[PDB]
Every structure is written in C-alpha cells, then in structure tokens.
A = this chain, B = another copy of it.
Amino acid sequence: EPETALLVAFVAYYTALIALIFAILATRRLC
C-alpha cells in the first residue's frame, strides 16, 4: 500500500502534535 503510508504519517504527525501540546500544558499546569 503506497497511499496508506501518508495516512498513518499524517495521523502520527498530528497525534504527536497533540501529545506535544499536552506535555507543554501539563508542565505549565503544575509549575
């Protein structure tokens, strides 16, 4: 599957951005 690779990469790219912001929010919530 050639087109499926972009599907998982985009989901991974946005999910990692969601996890990136949550880590920023969790740091600034305690601190």
Q: Which residues on the B side are within 8 Å of A4 (C-beta)?
A: 6, 29
Chain B min CB distance to A21 (Å): 8
User: For chain A, which range describes its interface: under 10, 10 to 19, 20 to 34, or 35 or more residues?
Assistant: 20 to 34
Q: How far is the CA of A28 from the CA of B26 in the complex (A)?
A: 9
Q: Which residues on the B side are within 8 Å of A29 (C-beta)?
A: 1-2, 4-5, 8, 27
Knowing A16-B15, A29-B27 are in contact, say whether A22-B6 is a contact too (CB < 8 A).
no
Knowing A1-B29, A29-B1 are in contact, say whether A13-B23 is a contact too (CB < 8 A).
yes
Nearest to A18 among chain B residues (CB) is: B15
Chain B min CB distance to A4 (Å): 6
Q: Are B15 and A20 in contact (CB under 8 A)?
A: yes
